[PDB]
Design a protein around this ligand. Structure first.
Ligand code: NA
Ligand code: NA
Lengths: 26, 25, 26, 25
């Protein structure tokens, strides 16, 4: 648990959500 | 209770996470 | 931006997701 | 591409957030 882990997880989750939103509409 | 509602929900959650990242930095 | 805000947001989002999962199945 | 898949996805995202909170504390 550190700033780099928090940042990486937050950015991975945001990208996972962009992909999920994209496929949901398609 | 449709795809549009889930889509808006997902965008809202994504932007709440971006706001945490921006505040953290 | 601080530890209390991060904690509160993470806990609010988890609870919002418990409610969304609950209503999705129902 | 059904409700079961979205349900598992949502549980996965929720548990990933609990893991960040636990690591933070
Ligand atoms: Na970046
Ligand atoms: Na608590």
């Amino acid at each position: 648990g550190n700033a780099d882990e928090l940042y990486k997880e937050x950015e991975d989750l945001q990208e996972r959500x962009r992909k999920l939103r994209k496929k949901x509409r398609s």
